[PDB]
Amino acid sequence: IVGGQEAPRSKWPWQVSLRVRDRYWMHFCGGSLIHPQWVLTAAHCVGPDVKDLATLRVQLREQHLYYQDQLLPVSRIIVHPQFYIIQTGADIALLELEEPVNISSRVHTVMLPPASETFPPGMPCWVTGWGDVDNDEPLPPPFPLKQVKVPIMENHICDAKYHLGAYTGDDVRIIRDDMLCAGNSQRDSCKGDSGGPLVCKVNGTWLQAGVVSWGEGCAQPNRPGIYTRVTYYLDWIHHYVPK
Amino acid sequence: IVGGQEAPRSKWPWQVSLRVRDRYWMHFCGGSLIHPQWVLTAAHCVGPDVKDLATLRVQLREQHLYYQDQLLPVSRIIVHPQFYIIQTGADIALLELEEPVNISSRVHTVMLPPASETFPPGMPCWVTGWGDVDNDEPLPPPFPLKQVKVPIMENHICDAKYHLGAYTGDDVRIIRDDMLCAGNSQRDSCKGDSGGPLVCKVNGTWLQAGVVSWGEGCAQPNRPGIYTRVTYYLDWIHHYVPK
Amino acid sequence: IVGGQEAPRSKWPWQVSLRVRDRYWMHFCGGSLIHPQWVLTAAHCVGPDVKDLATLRVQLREQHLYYQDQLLPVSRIIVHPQFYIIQTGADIALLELEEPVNISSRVHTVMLPPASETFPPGMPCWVTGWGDVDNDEPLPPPFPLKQVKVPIMENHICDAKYHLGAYTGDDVRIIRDDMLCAGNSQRDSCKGDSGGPLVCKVNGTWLQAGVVSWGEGCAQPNRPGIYTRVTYYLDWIHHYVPK
């Protein structure tokens, strides 16, 4: 997370860390608890190929990575079928836990947004995670969970921004309707934050607007972070997660 | 180049090396002389952003990289406008040299194929470059130019391979018509070969069938290398390069 | 530590971690609390040059590195004067804390041996630390303190091991009287354990026999770890550390 601060222990009870087996259970992406037995994340996190589930684990909200682990094995991995190698569309996936987790004040689900929520500019949102604090700059030990408020940028304005300084044709769309834009040259998510949540407060309630997906660099000028727009995949999500 | 051998001095007179300004003029991509004053290469090589020409140079056919350099500046770069970050389609670009090069038997252009050539399986083709000789294994000093014969795979068969062991839906197309597939688990191009040429011997003549673009891993099972199909972009190329 | 296991919380209350100011207070060496206000360590850890104390901190017994840090400033550093760059003899040093620490059962000093103790082969000894778990393999997160029982090898037998497969002359001494040897191809200390303690259980009491100093590789055949023999420097130590 670029330009933020360490999150208080009571914030983001839905944040999860995904780990892969490599000398230790190493963090590679974030995710969010959207149902006691389901985790929402980015498809490219559990890609490219179909993964052996024995090499993957889920860690529920912990303030510091690795220290008080209570790894949870995964029962099923579901990746949106529109997703494919080298491409950013349909960057969304589901992880089914082998069993429901205990729900509490410190650990519980984040609400999915209603289909009509567009999360227009001005909406107060935050992205959280354990990723890098700047380009090629990893989060130092003890690995505290970080947060940062990021401004939303209307999709069309975002798409135009991504054309500033690029060879791409103005008439060629870079930012798609299933995406969402947030962040500036001071605040942003970054490598390691992928699959993590972007939440916005709407009339007192936290709603998950996006899933950390990609961006050109981190906190780079005219290059807001790009998230997968959750509302666009609610029907798909509801085909697996109980409402 | 994975699984090949050093190329004889008299072969591949159209191969070029692109250099970026670092502690020295470092090789980052390949390219090809398709006209005395024009180099064909991959859009992603001159990407992501609009490049400052002062940081780039072109090196014509040499047997070893850096040894007998005669660097050429670049007049302008033209990247296919349908090209964009994190997307592999329309991966093709043009470099105009400040001056036309002296054509010789040791250094001359490669012929582009007629729109009708499909380069079907069985065609004998070679891909050349100074890239990695295997996954995460760079070409070692003295950096000889390498070549490897690579089998062509029909687009649909190729598309089906890429769906093997992947979450992508069978109806979702991974390999597109502007693409071409070649290579196997023994022979292929790799990191650093990018933008280089795939040339096939057709009725006694060498024709450039493709530009090294991407692939999952290098020489990985059921994941042949993907090339930008040259015939698909002949009208665009001819819009800039004289006949 | 190579080949050991995580240490129980109630063991090695004298182990200390030394920290250097980087992107965080990074561990670089171990040390031991031999007096409420003094830490014993290796000269090469505080070498080669006179260190600026502002870049150094001491961390008393903790189960995991960085997690529950309570860093302590260092008042002064005293390196044995016979010590010098590229030489392994007299590798011993002292750190005076700014304040004496509160002694408890979870955190207290280790007893120094009497001048007469030779720590002969067969003695049960443990070496502890947060160093590499094998050659070029750092301790992975969450960085638990490790311990490993290491066999003692008599000085002369050790000296002869070190001449095996080496060009050094049989008459040229490699292991000196101020040294002690422990470890085998299965168990040993390694990079990062340096300055830490080798303690042996003698007649119901734990005595610090050595300070992790050097060795050829880690757990390499016929190359036991070399420690600074504590008894040899008792008069120097007592010239500074109260009784």
Place this chain on the structure above:
Amino acid sequence: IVGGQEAPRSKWPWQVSLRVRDRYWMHFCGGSLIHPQWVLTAAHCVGPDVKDLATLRVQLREQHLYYQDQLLPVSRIIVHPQFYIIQTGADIALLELEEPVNISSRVHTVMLPPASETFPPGMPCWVTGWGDVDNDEPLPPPFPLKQVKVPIMENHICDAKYHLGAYTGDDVRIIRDDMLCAGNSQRDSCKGDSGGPLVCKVNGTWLQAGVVSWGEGCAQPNRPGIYTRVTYYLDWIHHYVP
């Protein structure tokens, strides 16, 4: 080599590069041709342990590393018996080629100094090699052989310099008699240069004064580069080299 320039093709005809097998014959140290069949180098280069000779090769003077290789296998490796792990004394070794090399204007031997030459301060010397051009900064391709003139620093003055900023006792010698000091914060040899030659011109003749050995950092303040003094090991060298 720090602070120098690329060497002309006609200089240092005695410079050699030592290569170890690792994906390619990779340079790890330098050496010098002191006899048609013998190479002088540093002992720590052919250390830590007794090496399997099949993993080692010698390359005679090339302007650029790797490009026009003609690797030569080694017949025997002789390391001064006083040398041992983690210590810089007797840092000198000999490599016997399986056969004499052809001698020419471009490739030939460097003269060993007479026992009485002390190479006092003021003497014009150069150190050559393919090592790093600064700390943690490797020589970039095409890897040209570099050279640099380094000033000599009298042994005692050198030893005192190495005590500046260190915990070591003044009465404890750091720089020994079998060593020699040269360089300053602008000019010095460095990692990759080890085993290579330090030569000084004495009354028109080039003499090998030292073998690149060690130093604290590269071109660091009050830390001249340290070479093995050749004169000190002439008798040992003469037990093997005709």
